[PDB]
From a paper:
Herein, we have described and characterized the structure and catalytic mechanism of BiuH, a cysteine hydrolase that hydrolytically deaminates biuret during cyanuric acid catabolism by R. leguminosarum bv. viciae 3841. The protein is a tetramer (consistent with SEC); each monomer adopts a five-stranded parallel β-sheet which is surrounded by α-helices. Helices α2, α4 and α5 (residues 95–102, 178–186, and 202–213, respectively) make symmetric interactions to another protomer in the tetramer, forming a dimer, as part of the basis of the quaternary structure.
BiuH and its variants were treated with N-carbamoyl aspartic acid, which is a substrate analog previously demonstrated to inhibit BiuH activity. B. Active site of the Lys142Ala variant of BiuH showing Cys175 bound to the inhibitor N-carbamoyl-D,L-aspartic acid and the difference density map (Fo −Fc), with the active site amino acids and the inhibitor shown in stick and the difference density map (Fo −Fc) in green mesh. Mutagenesis of Asp36 and Lys142 support this mechanism: Asp36 cannot be substituted for other amino acids and Lys142 can only be replaced by an arginine residue (with a ~25-fold reduction in activity relative to the wild-type enzyme). The nucleophile forms a tetrahedral covalent intermediate with the substrate, with the developing oxyanion stabilised by the main-chain nitrogens of Cys175 and Thr171. Thereafter ammonia is released and an acyl intermediate is formed between the substrate and enzyme. This intermediate is subsequently hydrolyzed to release the product (allophanate) and regenerate the active site for further catalysis.
Numbering used by the authors:
A (entry chain D), C (entry chain B): 8 to 233
B (entry chain A): 4 to 233
D (entry chain C): 5 to 233
The structure:
Amino acid sequence: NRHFIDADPYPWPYNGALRPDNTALIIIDMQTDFCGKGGYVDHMGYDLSLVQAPIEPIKRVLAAMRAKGYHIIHTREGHRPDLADLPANKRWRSQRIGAGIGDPGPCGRILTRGEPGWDIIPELYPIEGETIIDAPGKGSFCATDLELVLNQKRIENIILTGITTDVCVSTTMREANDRGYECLLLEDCCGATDYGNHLAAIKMVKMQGGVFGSVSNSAALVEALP
Amino acid sequence: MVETNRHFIDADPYPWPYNGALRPDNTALIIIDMQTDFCGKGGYVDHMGYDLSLVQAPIEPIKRVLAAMRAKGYHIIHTREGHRPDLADLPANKRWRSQRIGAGIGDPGPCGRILTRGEPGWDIIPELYPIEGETIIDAPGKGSFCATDLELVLNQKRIENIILTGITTDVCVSTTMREANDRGYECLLLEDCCGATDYGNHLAAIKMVKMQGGVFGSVSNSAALVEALP
Amino acid sequence: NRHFIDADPYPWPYNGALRPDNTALIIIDMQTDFCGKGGYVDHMGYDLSLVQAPIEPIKRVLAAMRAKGYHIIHTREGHRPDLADLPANKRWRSQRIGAGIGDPGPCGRILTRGEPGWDIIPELYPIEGETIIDAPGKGSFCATDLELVLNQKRIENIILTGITTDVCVSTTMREANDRGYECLLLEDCCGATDYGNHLAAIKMVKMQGGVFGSVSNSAALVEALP
Amino acid sequence: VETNRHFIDADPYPWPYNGALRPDNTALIIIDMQTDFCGKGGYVDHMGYDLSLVQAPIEPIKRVLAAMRAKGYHIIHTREGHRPDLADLPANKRWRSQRIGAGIGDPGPCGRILTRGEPGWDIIPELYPIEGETIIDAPGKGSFCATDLELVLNQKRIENIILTGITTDVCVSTTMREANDRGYECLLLEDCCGATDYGNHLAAIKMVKMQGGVFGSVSNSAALVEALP
Ligand SMILES: *C(=O)N[C@H](CC(=O)O)C(=O)O
Ligand SMILES: *C(=O)N[C@H](CC(=O)O)C(=O)O
Ligand SMILES: [Cl-]
């Protein structure tokens, strides 16, 4: 009763135990300030097109997985409004490049929970019953209840999407993989500030027989999802 | 002369550590996974067919940094990737992948059971071997924090700054750097003191650190570190 | 420049390093359903006076520590409204005793975040800049950002207050102590609905030369606080 | 009529809650049965406490251990202790131990107190591990803190934990609380634990039972061995 998705370097999940009850989609950090028109990344002159590219592929995967009753998880990078969870080095770096965490930005206080720019874009917005993780780090496990939630949901397989490929998505994939989760990265459903770094982060997954999991794409996933 | 207790290492994209609070008592070198298994002739990496020269290149630069930091009384930490001999800490997917490529964790190899604690090939290479008082972390994951006492030890030592070296750049070194950075540690990657299975991935992992004003920390090299280390 | 509070079994903190910048008060779980008139605990016929007794002593300690600029932290036990963070055993036990988590109670859904009964009582309500931890467990560290926050605040010493002495306060003290925090339990600022269990939890702290820290009272704290 | 649900008579509810009791999903944990905690010349003896209270659980544990080994249950052991360079030793923990005359790392009759690799730190011969039984080396009172215990339980797919060992109110209770918060279903065997003060042992057990079994449920060696599938 095994089911696989075509993937590189191996068909995923490794053991073919692919079911709605044991598999989650995670959509990482698809937040207005990071990928929306008029947010701080846009206003700062970064190559926003590369982080907007995955929106439509993610929307298709999200719709397909919702329709088949898979677990859906979302994450948002951000800080408590009093900045109690903000490391000093993280703050200092953000100030130095002109996007100081907690400082006023075009869509509210930058990377601050409760602010408009911090929230998930409307095109990928969560619905009731979809867990949202609020993460103070780049990895979604650090200082959150993500692992507790995955354990109570009995999730074994995670399909990763979102931004950026080399920062938050890679970090979360690496954390999950170390703990024994079986992870699939959808290459057309992620993007980064630097396309080369996006491509390299993907390549890194595949080495050593799939050191962090396996890699596929939205079409292959939607076509073969049970 | 005007003297300061703030000290920096020339680094990219910013002089490191960010606040200049660089002292023996608050700074550690970490040497990641310099094991016969990752960089010597008969280990898991060798078994997978990779070019050992890429992962041996950092040995001499690491040794120079290690000697300098030992001499000035900095904290020194070492890590080893590996599993309990009964494999109780080995995820099924990790095991399966290693078997599929012909380097099964726990399977017999030329230097003992692959990636298995207590086996000859699993140990740190003699030229970078720990000495007394240097904490060794035994990690079942690619990130040295997961399921270990690394964080507990860093906290009791009051370490604020970490200088990262070892292998591989894109797997264990990058993962550990990311974990440390998320928790607030201030991290410096020494680019000539790491290496990978694929040189492009090594270079990209280094570039990833520098983006967004040093998203994971900053990057320097052994010569610049040794020259400016207080 | 050492300062100590009279305490049993040793004057606290052990090294006398007692300052506003390195010391936090934590007020654990002073929530309406647990200690308020008409909450679920009151309706079940527990002796609410035992969990109300700490309110006035806590108020005194809180006022003194606020005035001197110490760190103040609050905790609330509770679950996400979709119950994604709720272990099945925890749920089952709560149902069996007629106080099912997420079920309708006299002050809203029991132990559910955002419900009236779940919030902190008005007499001990947080003010801006006082971090609130929302905990799905009895120990306030599990699956939260408490440790991350303590680390960024450079907190070394923790003064524990709140309820219940033997469940959430003891668990949090044990977690903190294992990580190296230096903890003071204020015996008149905690309570449990079984007074014997309260007394025993306190005794447990003191054994082996203060195995979990030391124990004092609100008057001794306020008198000697620097 | 047969069922694959199985329960152990326990207080306040029959355990495990859902009757899903199998060798593959259930572990015994034996906490800190070390010469340091229950032997002459160890840490606990140095602090003046009565060793009979912490030796009492030895024979009941031995019986449970034998029964669970014979039926192929997972067996886990823990040892409280520190790296020999004391890198994992909080300063307050050390200071307290010195103040009462049982300093961690200090020389004792059975080697350096609470120090990994020393004779006094090892598990007593009567309850010694065998191959395939995971041993956790814990720098804290709770066996989860800074260890791989949770990773191991997750890879073994363990759902149910039966707790034994010493002391009831310190290491056993702490580990039970940690496990319970994460969703593990825990049974404390009251005759298979003991403490420095019998009243504190009894109270730690009572604390488990309140609020419908806030930390799990409680039974005894005879009831467990009689009903273990
Ligand atoms: C996680 O990766 N979050 C942000 C988004 C950005 O466009 O800067 C990041 O990249 O680190
Ligand atoms: C932490 O102790 N929370 C509650 C309060 C109650 O009165 O029932 C608990 O005891 O579990
Ligand atoms: Cl200075």
